[PDB]
């Protein structure tokens, strides 16, 4: 390779898997975008371990050795992080096209002073809350552009874009169809097709709305139907589209107009980081003259928007901080270094601690290192005190595990293999079952009705996991979460054995909206769920093979692909095709093409009939037009359109490539 | 199951054939004893008899049908309750008793088992070991096993053999396996011939019941 | 050591599926596998030549136990009869029968020390 592109916490293994095999001197520079999430993240934390681990190892060989090249937005300890990092430093305010930011009360629209730029009239009223939402949205459209429409909730995205794209069929015409007849109509047809053909389907509301240049956009939706989307609004073909916050911290995706809803988020007044990531949004460069923001107050709420047009940033914090004497992030950051094997005596750690982002900015360090002696992690020996891994240390460090977690682990495993089912899977799909967050909101009571149904294989592992019946009432009757007590880690367990029962049949290959109704949850947090799962999968069958428990590795080193496919075992060998998914896999297979041998020496046209069967229709389907024969229905990843002929030849041709790599 | 004789009509042309005949009714009774035990199916065209899934099991893993049945309930026994923290368990599936391997010392057994860690302790108890009938071993040489229950002998027998068989593979020299034990090595050296081999066939058998974490 | 009477395996199956879990754990306990249950409604095969098909026992008996136990849960005759499908004069000559067996059993534990299971 030349340049590996990572996520923080993939690149941070990768850092360690440099360590290990001391080819630290491949590496020649890191490159850090958004270095505002060095303060303060549920990931942003490794940002660090992983600059300092680089800071201390690059301190050890004190001509160019290792560079280092960080942005962000405008911080005020931006000096500090320069200093650290002994960087050169550079900040400007350029920016090629002006940001009006502005709020509306009212009829009035006013800039960061309270002084008047424009006192708003709507061109023609419509019935509603409408507090000119609509008319700002039509005033854009009009003059050939686009806006992004920020809502706090999922549910008024969809209501939103269902009021805007209604009111844009009676307004131009003055009084779920085809495109209007523009240059564009074959390209919104493309991408209602495109939507069509997805594991997902086409959703009920966006068949309203997209064929009036109107979509929505939230968590809510797979992350192909969001790429569909973002790809259609960056192209033209969506000009009104109500998003989340989900989208202000995503892609790159400008307009001319932001209209912010409302300064009250989820119930609460809206983050500062946040406003500042939707009006960054405001003014294509090379299209637009100025980019305007709006946010839409009451004169309650009115002081708080003021707020957020003057506010800035916070500092940024270290994530390694002391009430409390052992931290989490400390405890991680030292466990990296003795077992890596970069930090063995006792002085090498304090030398680790200047180079902190902690100690930039002017003892507990051995607080953690005795917190790792006190559970097994390292070793002391007798040349006095040097610390060393022990093999739990080092079965950590390789799964890329939590210390803090890894504890709990070690025993659950160690009781699994006490008494264990193998009549079924699920028991499997509980050890890698992840419990570190919500991704979503349970029904008790569904579940309960799902508990009373369940087979007499699936309660026997249950009740060898900690499920009781009388807390699975106790849940429905009162909404008691408790929670306080830190033994009340029994409700992780039931919320782990309620996400097990989704992982189960998805890796039963069970249509996403079977799943969406039997469970209660949306297709967007299932599909987060389950590339969650596969990561953790591959961690606790690394963590069981560093151990040495072969039993325990052999039955887990099977649900890691199926997790991530959402497959049974037979398609393992289809999904290695760049193209197949879960869907096109088991199609191809109950057509005779098992193996990529059996697709190899496939006749092309052949396959493009099978996929054509694939599809969900909502009449009971699945004109002789030939204009459909160049169509591009089929979407892929850095994509150019593809045809549903096309897609078949790619496939024949990329199983022909890997069976010939396979010899 | 070979699907070499469907119908009626070619069991008796099989009975032609036999050994039995060349030296001149019962081979309907075996028919009706496969459909009884689930080993054969029969389809409504009058009367053809077809094989099942535990059936095609049986026939490929090359088991006798009369310990087919014991051994089809044991694994699912084990599959409900499994111990995976050692290796123990599963030898003791792949641990063949259906003869005498060597004449068993009680006393030590009994010795060896005080002496043995909790691990393979729960295995023991998860199987069917009673220490009360260890006991009632070296008190008295009483075999009983009249009684056709009384295949309580031969899981006592089984998990001794199960003991040998771990050392074994743990690479422990013949030499002390014949001492700990107090069996000659040509009667050790028979046993893992027989436990190589049939080890093998409740892999297969667990194969084409599609049991695949018990297969792996 | 003797049938009362001629139980019906589905209605069986049917109320084993209703059957509440601290009553399925004894089930278990016992030796009550579900896959049996299903293979005598399917198939009226008694088997029972083999001596270890003891197993046909089992079932008859916690079936008779769950019997028992309605009845010393003072459930009405009829609601009884309708329930399992067995008549009045089966039930009754079924508890004379476990009343002298249970004095029976509550004397062989006592008379080998076994104090908190005679209790
Ligand atoms: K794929
Ligand atoms: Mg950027």
């Given at each position: 390779?030349?340049?590996?592109?990572?996520?923080?916490?993939?690149?941070?293994?990768?850092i360690?898997?440099?360590?290990?095999?001391?080819?630290?001197?491949?590496?020649?520079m890191?490159?850090?975008?958004e270095?505002?999430m060095?303060?303060?993240?549920?990931?942003?934390?490794?940002?660090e371990?992983?600059?300092?681990?680089?800071?201390?190892?690059?301190?050890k060989?004190?001509?160019?050795?290792?560079?280092?090249?960080?942005?962000?937005?405008?911080?005020?300890?931006?000096?500090?992080?320069?200093?650290?990092?002994?960087?050169?430093?550079?900040?400007?305010?350029?920016?090629?096209?002006?940001?009006?930011?502005?709020?509306?009360?009212g009829?009035?629209?006013?800039?960061?002073?309270?002084?008047?730029?424009?006192?708003?009239?709507?061109?023609?009223?419509?019935?509603?809350?409408?507090?000119?939402?609509?008319?700002?949205?039509?005033?854009?459209?009009?003059?050939?552009?686009?806006?992004?429409?920020?809502c706090?909730?999922?549910?008024?995205?969809?209501?939103?874009?269902?009021?805007?794209?209604?009111?844009?069929y009676?307004?131009?015409?003055?009084?779920?169809?085809?495109?209007?007849?523009?240059?564009?109509?074959?390209?919104?047809?493309?991408?209602?097709?495109?939507?069509r053909?997805?594991?997902?389907?086409?959703?009920?509301?966006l068949?309203?709305?997209?064929?009036?240049?109107v979509?929505?956009?939230?968590?809510?939706?797979?992350?192909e139907?969001?790429?569909?989307?973002?790809?259609?609004?960056?192209?033209?073909?969506?000009?009104?589209?109500?998003?989340?916050?989900?989208?202000?911290?995503?892609?790159?995706?400008?307009?001319?107009?932001?209209?912010?809803?409302?300064?009250?988020?989820?119930?609460?007044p809206?983050?500062?980081?946040?406003?500042?990531?939707?009006?960054?949004?405001?003014?294509?460069?090379?299209?637009?003259?100025?980019?305007?923001?709006?946010l839409?107050?009451?004169?309650?709420?009115?002081?708080?928007?003021?707020?957020?047009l003057?506010?800035?940033?916070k500092?940024?914090?270290?994530?390694?901080?002391?009430?409390?004497?052992?931290?989490g992030?400390?405890?991680?950051?030292?466990?990296?270094?003795?077992?890596?094997?970069?930090?063995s005596?006792?002085?090498?750690m304090?030398?680790?601690?200047?180079?902190?982002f902690?100690?930039?900015?002017?003892?507990?360090?051995?607080?953690?290192?005795?917190?790792?002696?006190?559970?097994?992690?390292?070793?002391?020996?007798?040349?006095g005190?040097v610390?060393?891994?022990?093999?739990?240390?080092?079965?950590?460090?390789?799964?890329?595990?939590?210390?803090?977690?890894?504890?709990?682990?070690?025993?659950?495993?160690?009781?699994?293999?006490?008494?264990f089912?193998?009549?079924?899977?699920?028991?499997?799909?509980?050890?890698?079952?992840?419990?570190?967050?919500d991704?979503?909101?349970?029904?008790?009571?569904?579940?309960?009705?799902?508990w009373?149904?369940l087979?007499?294989?699936?309660?026997?592992?249950?009740?060898?996991?900690g499920?009781?019946?009388?807390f699975?009432?106790?849940?429905?009757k009162?909404?008691?979460?408790?929670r306080?007590?830190?033994?009340?880690?029994q409700?992780?367990?039931?919320?782990?054995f309620?996400?097990?029962?989704?992982?189960?049949?998805?890796?039963?290959?069970?249509?996403?909206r079977?799943?969406?109704?039997?469970?209660?949850?949306?297709?967007?947090?299932?599909?987060?769920?389950?590339?969650?799962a596969?990561?953790?999968?591959?961690?606790?069958?690394?963590?069981?093979?560093?151990?040495?428990?072969?039993?325990?590795?052999?039955?887990?080193?099977?649900?890691?692909?199926?997790?991530?496919?959402?497959?049974?075992?037979?398609?393992?060998?289809?999904?290695?095709?760049?193209?197949?998914?879960?869907?096109?896999?088991r199609?191809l297979?109950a057509?005779?093409?098992?193996?990529?041998?059996?697709?190899?020496?496939?006749?092309?046209?052949?396959?493009?009939?099978?996929?054509?069967?694939?599809?969900?229709?909502?009449?009971?389907?699945?004109?002789?037009?030939?204009?459909?024969?160049?169509?591009?229905?089929?979407?892929?990843?850095?994509?150019?359109?593809?045809?549903?002929?096309?897609?078949?030849?790619?496939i024949v041709?990329?199983?022909?490539?890997?069976?010939?790599?396979?010899?």
């Open positions: 390779l030349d340049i590996a592109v990572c996520t923080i916490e993939r690149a941070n293994g990768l360690n898997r440099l360590i290990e095999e001391n080819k630290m001197d491949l590496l020649g890191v490159v850090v975008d270095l505002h060095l303060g303060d993240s549920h990931r942003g934390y490794l940002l371990l992983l600059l300092t681990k680089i800071c201390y190892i690059t301190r060989s004190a001509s160019n050795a290792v560079q280092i090249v960080g942005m962000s937005a405008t911080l005020p300890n931006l000096e500090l992080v320069a200093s650290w990092l002994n960087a050169e430093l550079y900040h400007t305010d350029f920016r090629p096209v002006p940001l009006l930011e502005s709020v509306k009360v009829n009035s629209i006013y800039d960061s002073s309270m002084k008047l730029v424009r006192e708003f009239e709507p061109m023609l009223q419509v019935k509603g809350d409408e507090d000119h939402v609509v008319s700002l949205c039509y005033e854009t459209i009009c003059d050939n552009h686009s806006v992004l429409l920020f706090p909730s999922k549910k008024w995205c969809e209501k939103l874009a269902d009021i805007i794209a209604r009111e844009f009676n307004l131009h015409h003055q009084a779920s169809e085809c495109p209007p007849v523009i240059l564009e109509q074959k390209e919104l047809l493309e991408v209602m097709d495109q939507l053909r997805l594991p997902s389907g086409l959703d009920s509301v068949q309203k709305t997209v064929p009036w240049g979509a929505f956009h939230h968590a809510g939706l797979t992350f139907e969001r790429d569909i989307i973002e790809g259609a609004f960056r192209q033209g073909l969506i000009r009104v589209l109500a998003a989340t916050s989900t989208l202000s911290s995503g892609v790159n995706l400008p307009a001319r107009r932001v209209i912010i809803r409302t300064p009250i988020f989820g119930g609460r809206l983050d500062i980081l946040t406003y500042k990531q939707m009006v960054g949004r405001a003014g294509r460069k090379g299209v637009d003259t100025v980019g305007e923001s709006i839409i107050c009451k004169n309650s709420e009115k002081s708080k928007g003021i707020a957020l003057q506010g800035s940033l500092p940024v914090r270290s994530c390694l901080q002391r009430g409390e004497e052992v931290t992030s400390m405890i991680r950051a030292i466990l990296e270094i003795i077992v890596g094997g970069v930090a005596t006792s002085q090498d304090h030398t680790y601690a200047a180079c902190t902690l100690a930039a900015s002017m003892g507990a360090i051995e607080a953690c290192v005795m917190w790792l002696l006190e559970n097994e992690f390292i070793q002391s020996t007798e040349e005190k610390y060393h891994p022990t093999h739990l240390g080092s079965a950590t460090l390789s799964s890329s595990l939590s210390p803090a977690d890894t504890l709990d682990i070690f025993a659950d495993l160690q009781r699994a293999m006490k008494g089912v193998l009549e079924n899977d699920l028991h499997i799909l509980y050890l890698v079952t992840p419990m570190f967050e991704w979503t909101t349970i029904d008790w009571y569904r579940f309960f009705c799902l009373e149904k087979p007499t294989s699936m309660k026997r592992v249950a009740e060898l996991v499920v009781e019946e009388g699975l009432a106790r849940c429905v009162g909404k008691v979460v408790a306080t007590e830190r033994q009340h880690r409700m992780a367990i039931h919320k782990r309620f996400t097990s029962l989704v992982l189960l049949d998805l890796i039963s290959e069970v249509p996403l079977e799943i969406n109704q039997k469970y209660g949850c949306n297709r967007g947090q299932i599909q987060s769920l389950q590339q969650s596969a990561v953790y999968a591959g961690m606790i069958t690394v963590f069981s093979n560093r151990l040495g428990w072969h039993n325990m590795e052999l039955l887990l080193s099977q649900f890691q692909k199926r997790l991530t496919f959402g497959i049974q075992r037979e398609l393992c060998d289809l999904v290695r095709v760049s193209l197949l998914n879960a869907q096109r896999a199609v297979y057509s005779g093409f098992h193996t990529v041998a059996d697709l190899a020496r496939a006749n092309i046209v052949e396959v493009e009939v099978i996929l054509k069967n694939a599809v969900p229709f909502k009449s009971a389907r699945k004109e002789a037009v030939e204009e459909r024969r160049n169509m591009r229905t089929i979407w892929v990843t850095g994509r150019k359109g593809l045809t549903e002929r096309e897609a078949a030849a790619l041709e990329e199983a022909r490539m890997i069976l010939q790599q396979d010899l």
